[PDB]
Structures are given as C-alpha cells and as structure tokens.
Amino acid sequence: ASASKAAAFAQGGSSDPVPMPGKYPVVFSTGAGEPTRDQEFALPVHKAFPLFGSVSDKYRRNPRYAEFRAHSEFTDGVFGTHLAVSSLLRLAQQLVHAHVNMGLPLGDFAPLASSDVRIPSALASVVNQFGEFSSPSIGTRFLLRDFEHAVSRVVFLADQLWTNGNSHHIFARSWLPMSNNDGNFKTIVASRLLEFISAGDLSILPTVLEDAVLSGEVPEAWEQVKDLLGDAPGVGQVDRRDRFDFLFKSYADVGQFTTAFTTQAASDVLTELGLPWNSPSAGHLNWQYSTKQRFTFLADTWAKLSAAYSQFFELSSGLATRQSATGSHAQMVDLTSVEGVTVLKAALALSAPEFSLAACFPPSCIFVGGLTRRVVVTTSLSVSQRATEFCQMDWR
Amino acid sequence: ASASKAAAFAQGGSSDPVPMPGKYPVVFSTGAGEPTRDQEFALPVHKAFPLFGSVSDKYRRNPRYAEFRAHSEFTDGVFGTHLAVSSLLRLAQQLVHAHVNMGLPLGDFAPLASSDVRIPSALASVVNQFGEFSSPSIGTRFLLRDFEHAVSRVVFLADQLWTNGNSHHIFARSWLPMSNNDGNFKTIVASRLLEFISAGDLSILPTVLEDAVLSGEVPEAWEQVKDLLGDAPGVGQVDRRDRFDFLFKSYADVGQFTTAFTTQAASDVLTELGLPWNSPSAGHLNWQYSTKQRFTFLADTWAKLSAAYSQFFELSSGLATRQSATGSHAQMVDLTSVEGVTVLKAALALSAPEFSLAACFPPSCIFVGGLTRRVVVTTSLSVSQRATEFCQMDWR
Amino acid sequence: LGLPWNSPSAGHLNWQYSTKQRFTFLADTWAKLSAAYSQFFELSSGLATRQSATGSHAQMVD
C-alpha cells in the first residue's frame, strides 16, 4: 500500500442505435385494457387508440427530456418546440422509459446516441406514417417499414440496421468497425467493403465464381444492394431511388431481403405508399405539421382518451429533468426462450428491474466502446520519482 | 414500479493468458537494494541473487495458493507439493501479486484461464532455464526465450502469444475467435486461418502474387510459419523440430518471426542448447528435481535470501488461503508514455492501486468474454401472467 | 564528438530523456546520494514557493 498520484475519475464514451421492431406490436396488441369492462365501450373504436399511445412520449418527453438534453446535449427548440405530456402513457412508458433509457453506467464506461436529428425525424414519420394510414398492418408491412430502416434523408442510422445482415452471414469474416461507415458513400462501398472486405471475406463466405450465369444471390447481390445503397439512394429522390432501392429491396433481391427484414408489403405496399419524401421533409412536416398535429392527436389524446379519466390508472408527465432518463443497462438484448426463459448477456444491469424487463427488453443497437480513459499527466511525478521513493523502502 | 420475479446473481466466466516479458527484467535490474549501503557486501555475488528473487512465490505460494485452488479447480499436490514460502519477496510479490492476481470482478463478469498445467510447467523451466544457466542474457536472448513462447509439449499457451502477431498486421481483417485455437492442429493452416482466413484476408493484407520468386517474404510465410506451427512441431521432437521451428524461427524465417517474435539467438543458443525437452521434459524434471532443487534454491531464499537477516525490509508471504489472490484489474494493460504517463484502464479497476500499480505490473493478454448469465426459468410467470397483472393496473 | 545537436537536440532529449534519466540519476541523488544516510550533514531542499529565490546581490562580481 504505497502512494503514487491516485484519484478517482468518472467517464462516458460509446455509441447507440435504435430500431423499429415488432416489439411495439407486442406492446400495442391491445392487452393493456381490451379485456377491461368499465363499459367505456360507449366511445367508439379502440384499434389505433391503444397503439398510437406508443409515441408522443417515448421520443420527446420521456427520452428527449433527460437523455438527449442532459447528455451534454444543448438541444434546439425546433425538435422540442413542444415539450409534451400524454397521460395515456399506460403502464408502458414510465416503464418503457425505464426500459428504453438512453444511458450506460459510469462505474463501467458507456453512453448512447448517433443521430437524433435523423432518428426522431423518422420516428415521428412512423408515428404519422403508421398512426395515420392504417393503424395495424398486421406485422407484415408496417413492421417492415420500421424494421426496413426505411428510406432516408442521407443520414438514417439504417447502415447499422443493415450492417446487422452482412455481419451475421459472414462467420469467419470479422470486420473492422470501418464497415460501420459503409452506410453512405459512392466508391468506398465497392473497395473497402464489397471488394476488399469481400473479394477477401466475400470470396470465401460464398465463392460462387459462376460463369455465364451472373453471380445471382450468394453474397454477390447483398454486396450489389450494398453497392446500391452506396450509389443509387444518395443521388437524390425520384423513382430512380425508390424504384432502385425497391429494385434492390424488391425483385431478384428476394434473397437479399431474406437476410435482413422484408415483405412485399413494405416495399410494394409501404414503399409504394409513401413517396420517397415520406422520410425526408415528411420528417420535417411531421415535426412542423405532424408535431403540431401531434398536438391535435395529443390534445385529442389529452381530450379524448383523457376522458378515460374514469377507470383510474393513468397519470401525467410532470417534466423529467429531475426524473432523468438514463441508467438502464438496455445494452445487449436479454432474450432467449426455450420452454423456460433465459435473460442473457453482458451489462451488469440490475436486480429488481432485471426480470421485470419481461414487459419490454430494451435494446439499443449499441456498438459498445471499451473505453476507460484514465488520462494522466505526470508533470509532477515522472514515474521514476515514485520508483526511487518506493525503491528507497525495499533497500532498508 | 414493475418488479416481476427479480433476484440478483453473481457470476464468473472469461479467459486469461500470461507472458514472459522484459517486465521481469525491469523488476530484477537490481534497483531494490543495489545502492543500499549496510556493508552486507561481505564477499558475495549479487547478480542472479536478485533476479531469482520472486520466482518461487509468483507461481505457487502467491498466485497458485488462492487464484488456482480457490478458482474451483481441483488441484493436484504434485504441482504444489512444496507449498513453501520465500521471505525474500522484497517489495515485489505481495505487491507483484496484487499486481498480477488472477480474478476479475463479479460486479462485472470475468475470470482467469489458460492451462495451468502447461504455463507453470514452462515457468518453472524458465526459472531453471534462466536462474541456472544465463542469469541475465541482457534482454536479448533470455527475454526472447521467455517471450518467444518457447517450445511446447503440445499444449503451451504460445498460440495466443503468437496470435497477437497475425492480428496486429491484418488491419483490414478481424477474425472469429476460432483463430485462437490456431495453436495446434494439422489443418489450422491448410484450412481456416492461412487459406480461408487468409486467401481472403491475407490476399489483401499482402497480395504479392509474385511469379517465379516464391511469395513467402510477403507474410505468406507467417502463414507458413503458422503452417509449420501446425504441422512440424506437433509431430514430436525429432530434434529437427527445433531445426524446423528454428528454421521457421530462423533460417530466412527471420523476416517472418519479426512481427511478434524474439532473437534467433534465443533459439539456437537457448532452444538448441536447452534441447527440445527443456520445455516438456525440463518442466517435469524441473518440478520434481528443480522444484525440489527449488528448495535447494529456496534455501537460497531461506538461507541465501535468509542471510539478509539485517536490513529489515523483507518479510513477505505469511498467509494464503485467507489472503486470497484475485481481484485486480491489472488486465487490459492499456498503458502509454509520452512526456507524461497516461494509464488507460478498460476495466474500471481501482483508485488507490491504480497509479500505484503502474510501477511495474499490468498483466497479460486476456481474451475477454462479455458474459452475464442472468438466466431465468419461466415455470412460474409466463410473461403473459406478469403482463396480464401489470396490465390489470393499466385498465383501471 | 557531441555532434552539433548536443546543444539543441541534446537539450530536448536531455530534458525528456535526460531529465527523466535525470531521475535515474536523481535516483543517484535519492539512492546513490541517498546511501549517504549516515554521516548526517545532508538535508537540503525541503520547501520552495515559500523559500523564495531572489534577493542576493551576488551579481557584479567585483
């Protein structure tokens, strides 16, 4: 027990990603009150009413209230121009939030986020694209759109939700994180990944080498779709993009959609039902028309469903900022069912919440950055200094 | 506050290796008492006396007393037959131990492991190979033998100390852990890594493709040397095994083993002199002749090292079993020196030891295993039941 | 012998290798010079900042 310039430092450094999964569908299946008889069945319909209770809290008042802003994140009003409170936040939100709360431990060393200027923009879109069209496209379709990492405005975290695919297939092939950038760019998607990180690892995971038959499927197509996603979706809008995103997510590529996620009901349905701009300025008009209509749908919420005052379960959003929004080790998806469940994986989460997570196993497509920057200058203790000092105790 | 079947469980599971570095050389340079003037200098040689002062403790009494045995690994007395102690453990041992005690946190999820039936076997050898022949080969040579992950008896954690080399050069490539078992096997080089995990990632990191000039000088031989390590060292001794290994660790192969290997001298000098059995045959006879002699030399510790009766600084290794030997993140080295000394510690180690435990130690090349087995049978609360309940608090 | 750099290049490397070594040699002061444990005359340089270092006309030699 000797002494050489000690301290105690806290840190934060890592990445985070999110997905739109069939998870919401399990949370909006209408289990929450469909079988509740408080003759509230006076007021019509209850199909979308429940589902739509998903957004308007899980993206602005819950997560973007403490996670975003507090994350050393000086947020611009015009993305929170309207701090919202929807008492409809069933047992899923204060729960959901705890479930999905952007933030990792400090006793460890991680954090979350990569594009909250593009993600939300899309989410809002989805809430509108979904909570406006036909509320429940039965898994197939709506789920596709959301898990299809739908068309972008050039930023979209997509590339990550897509990176999932390629990696899974290439067993032996382990890629340098650089592959995480492949999302956008022209050539570098046909040199780094596709050619080098393919004619190398691709020429192995499936070395068809077919002759006079065009390497259809068998890696070479996923790469093409990859090459596409590189040059043919970043050149702008127009059918040339959808049609050639769709062509790349539609036909011939029926083998490329099998890797990731897809149904001829997302693409030919959703995709042919959104107008490429359904992700770009839709993401805008969904914030300055849909967010103001979010109002209507929120006020409608704080007016209609509010009327659900007569049951006695809901509560209101009383501004976090004190409530916070980070802490849950949503890291590494805790799921594995076989006769009996099995919550697994790294992220020494908790014990009281863990197992309570059944309602919702939060999952941020995190990258994970083993970083504990115990940065230390020694303009006062040239390592050696200590050395003699300590050395001068083993002598006597 | 949703609870549902919580618990709180602690676990352990991960890898762990070890290396013989120039680290010892910095701990045996004779800076602990070489300048001490108590006239102890009564006609005596103090060259090896210091260097060999830590061996008999840092491998049986210190580490193997708690780490090994307490690690739930049924130990055979004939690897600890002479559970003797050494009071010469100056300030480097109780320190060293804390510096190199194998036992990751539980608040996290990791542990130690990499053949303690082969490691110690070789270590004891080194103790003899070094502390007997050339007590200070001046970095070059002895350090080599140590770092060279010296000849094995088929086991040897070499394969890992060698894997540190083929992964360093291959930037564009990352490999599936399956490349760790790259050690021994006749196919490791004619299949997975070398051909596939090479004609793919190696045909990129060095795609010489030379004609009538034999392409081996371009890291295809590292694959060959790899090939060798695959088929030519596992075929027994045939002395040439050294010759080969040596050939592959010398003759032209110098340009091969200089990415993560030492000086050939420590191969023709050491290895050849040592006689291939000085790692398998030596180990045994070094454990049941040298370990017994370890006493004759422990006597050197409790007679030669004991003669240090008056200086009064020595008095280490009183307990065990109770003193334990696991719980110091001296793992993920992550140390860098520039003007000042910065010590980045991936795993949230400590703050009192950290900065104190930089004076020398920073343990081996663990192969981390993100594992937090938070398992959970569901023969009591079929997720629906819970959800069904919680849902019954979101209806009213 | 020194090589022209032994005044510019040396200085730097003498401040960030020799100053560090200055320790290895300071060790010579706190190990070699420290071995002088018993004679009992040495014990200088306890403070600074408070001890100051300016105010002696040891200037104009004369």
Next chain:
Amino acid sequence: PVVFSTGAGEPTRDQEFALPVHKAFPLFGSVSDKYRRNPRYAEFRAHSEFTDGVFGTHLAVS
C-alpha cells in the same frame, strides 16, 4: 570545478568507502537542484513568467 573538487567530504573518515567510486558522485551533486528545484522554483515562476510544466515536469528534489 572549485565546488566539485571534492573538498566537502573527500577527507571524511566514516568508512563510507565501501567499494565505491567517488569521482563524479560529488561533481554531479548540485545539478538537479541548481536549475529547477532551487532557482526555477521561485526565481523563474515567481518572476511573473508563465512557466510550462515541460521544463519543470519533474519538480523533484535532491
């Protein structure tokens, strides 16, 4: 040279002479103090001259 001629303890008989060389040992005994710990500790820094630690990184003593 007049301060390192070895007149401070060369004639001292305490038998400290236990197999050691005392030629440079004396001469080099003042360096590490007369330029950082002694002079540059107050003179320099207190002289209102914004000093960079990388000229006093090892504010060690002797």
